[PDB]
Amino acid sequence: AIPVKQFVKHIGELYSNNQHGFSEDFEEVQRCTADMNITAEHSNHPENKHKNRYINILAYDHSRVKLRPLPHSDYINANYVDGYNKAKAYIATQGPLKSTFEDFWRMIWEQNTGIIVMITNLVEKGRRKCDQYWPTENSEEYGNIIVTLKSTKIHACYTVRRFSIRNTKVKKGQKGNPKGRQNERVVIQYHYTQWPDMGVPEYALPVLTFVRRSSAARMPETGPVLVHCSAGVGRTGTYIVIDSMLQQIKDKSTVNVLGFLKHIRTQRNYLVQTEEQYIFIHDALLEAILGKETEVSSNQLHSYVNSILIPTRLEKQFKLVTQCFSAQKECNKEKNRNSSVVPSERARVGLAPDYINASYIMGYYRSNEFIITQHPLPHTTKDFWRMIWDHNAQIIVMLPFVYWPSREESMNCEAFTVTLISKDRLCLSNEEQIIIHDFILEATQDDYVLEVRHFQCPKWPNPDAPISSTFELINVIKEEALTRDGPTIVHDEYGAVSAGMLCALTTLSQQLENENAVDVFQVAKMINLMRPGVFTDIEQYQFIYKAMLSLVS
């Protein structure tokens, strides 16, 4: 209904006049089925009461997925929901209950479903949101369906779990069969793990990446993709609309959020659930239209790098990377070395009892894998060690004033003490050294001890070793991180380019290693979104490309 060129302009008009357009629109979505008198009598039947997570969240009779009768057994709180150019593309359903685990897996068998999108954690902020309907390891039995965990792939924002499910009351087929045994199928669960328990995601990028990967995983001649959260309406509907519109844009170069959303609200109630979720659909789709696509396979990286350097797509990416903080901003400016490099509000590292100049930064495997901070000032050394302590951080990378204790005198922080236990050194290629100091932080009013290793690195990157030697130091930190818990603290002077570059290059090399793909823009954009002024010159950004290129061999 809206050509994709009109969208920058379209969202501007929805945002304008105190966002009156968004408000009107979402109110229209809220009232657009009232007059249709859509019934949900099976949902409301007393016998199905225990099979509903919430009393208010129902499955409309006309679009509800029905289970085959067994000798009210037909009922599940799930509805078919259209996609783009496809009827019944999704089953949208609640987070299953222990009492409905069987029904859930039975419905996945009966509908020929191969993909589950789970957009919730099990427990969020002390509240049970979803029961665990899959085996932690090995196998578990849900009536006639045996569900086996085959593999788990963990990323920062989502986890992929490959399952084989076996229906014991279904025939095995012919032995020669290339498709395998016909009473077994693969189900892949794409589980988003970083959705806030309050409101909508701060960053559309990792959500867009999740939507795109989970969606492209739909195989032909397959049943509906199952999408659930807790209620199976808000995050679920959000997903379905960004997915469907992602596919509409690709095909027609139009976008139709309101009309499509009003349609699917005939299919399940309280799709999508909040005005803030409505706005996030728009934000994220706009972000999709404008950010192009930047993930590039290993065997395309050389050619891609070539064409982004010719007038330039590198320059246009970097303006988006450098587009990028209230507390910093502050009665805290004498805690900052340079207040052009400070944390955002969302990524700010809080001290338990407020401010330290430090930012959470994402890694490949975990959000909050790193903390990028500044070299501690003498009046910021107690705060620095309080951060280590509060976050149970066991690794400090210093990239060049001693803020650490000597053997003679321990450091007293009220809650704990810092004590050196040994000093040492690792060697590198050009006779370069990393100085190591090992500290223990012992609680003063408890018995906990935290082992913290400190790396003083040479000048890095070394401009007169091959660019591929940049990863030697990265690989040393990776290998230490394997044996330790908590975040990795990385600081240079301000928490700027050298700190960011260790984080970016670590992330991107874990990506190339694990996916044979690299997304330099996303990694660089997220670092700058979480801490403004890490990457400021285009040559630093180009060096991320050049460096990653040297590993493609």
Author numbering: 827 to 897, 903 to 1142, 1148 to 1160, 1168 to 1196, 1204 to 1250, 1260 to 1412
Article, verbatim:
The ∼280 residue PTP catalytic domain consists of an α/β structure, and biochemical and structural studies have led to a detailed understanding of the catalytic mechanism (Barford et al., 1994; Zhang, 2002). Here we report the crystal structures of 22 PTP domains, including two tandem-domain RPTP structures and a detailed structural comparison of this protein family.
We also report here structures of two tandem-domain RPTPs, RPTPɛ and RPTPγ, revealing the domain organization for the PTP subgroups R4 and R5. Sedimentation equilibrium confirmed that RPTPγ formed a stable dimer in solution. The experimental data fit well to a self-association model resulting in determination of a dissociation constant (KD) of 3.5 ± 0.3 μM. The dimer interface covers 1200 Å2 (∼5% of the total molecule surface area) and involves residues from the phosphotyrosine recognition loop, the P loop at the bottom of the active site cleft, and sheet β6, while the D2 domain interface involves the loop connecting strands β10–β11. In RPTPγ mutant “RKEE” residues, Arg958 and Lys960 of the D1 domain were mutated to glutamic acid, and in mutant “DDKK” residues, Asp1305 and Asp1306 of the D2 domain were mutated to lysine. Both the RKEE and DDKK mutants were entirely monomeric in solution, as assessed by velocity and equilibrium AUC analysis validating the head-to-toe dimerization model.
